[PDB]
Amino acid sequence: DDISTVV
Amino acid sequence: SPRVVRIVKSESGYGFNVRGQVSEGGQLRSINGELYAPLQHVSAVLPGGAADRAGVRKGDRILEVNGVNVEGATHKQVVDLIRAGEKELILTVLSV
């Protein structure tokens, strides 16, 4: 699965 | 077509989320009818934040970060590039 980061 | 956006960090950050694959490389996929290796993309934009004000939109695919090509890049590589500057970020994006 793809992953996410808040930047 | 690809476009360049400059974003200056608020103390809350750039105001967007980046989403995509953990690994390097992978199957090609066309974006707006043009062929690319896998691209990370913008999965959220904070209303009124720096990215929003700069014209970044949900779904934008990220082709370059700070002048470095990130076609096929790992998520870590893209995040590390986003973090390269103290306060400025330049992206090449493709809106979908």
UniProtKB/Swiss-Prot annotation, chain B:
Tissue occurrence: Isoform 1 is predominantly expressed in the testis, whereas isoform 2 is predominant in various brain regions, including, neocortex, paleocortex, striatum, hippocampus, cerebellum and brain stem. Expressed in cells of hematopoietic origin.
Subcellular location: Early endosome membrane; Cytoplasm, Cytosol
Chain positions found as Phosphoserine: S12, S23
Positions of the PDZ domain: 4-96
Segments passing through the bilayer: none
Recorded domain comment: The PDZ domain mediates binding to a subset of proteins containing a PDZ-binding motif at the C-terminus: the specificity for PDZ-binding motif is provided by the 2 residues located upstream of the canonical PDZ-binding motif. The PDZ domain also mediates binding to the retromer complex via direct interaction with VPS26 (VPS26A or VPS26B).
Function: Involved in the retrograde transport from endosome to plasma membrane, a trafficking pathway that promotes the recycling of internalized transmembrane proteins. Following internalization, endocytosed transmembrane proteins are delivered to early endosomes and recycled to the plasma membrane instead of being degraded in lysosomes.
Summary of subunit composition and partner proteins: Core component of the SNX27-retromer, a multiprotein complex composed of SNX27, the WASH complex and the retromer complex. Interacts (via PDZ domain) with a number of target transmembrane proteins (via PDZ-binding motif): ABCC4, ADRB2, ARHGEF7, GRIA1, GRIA2, GRIN1, GRIN2A GRIN2C, KCNJ6, KCNJ9 and SLC2A1/GLUT1. Interacts (via the FERM-like regions) with the WASH complex. Interacts with SNX1. Interacts with CYTIP. Interacts with DGKZ. Interacts with MCC. Interacts (via PDZ domains) with SLC9A3; directs SLC9A3 membrane insertion from early endosomes to the plasma membrane.
Name of the protein described by the UniProt record: Sorting nexin-27
Organism: Rattus norvegicus
Full protein: residues contained: 39 to 133 of 539
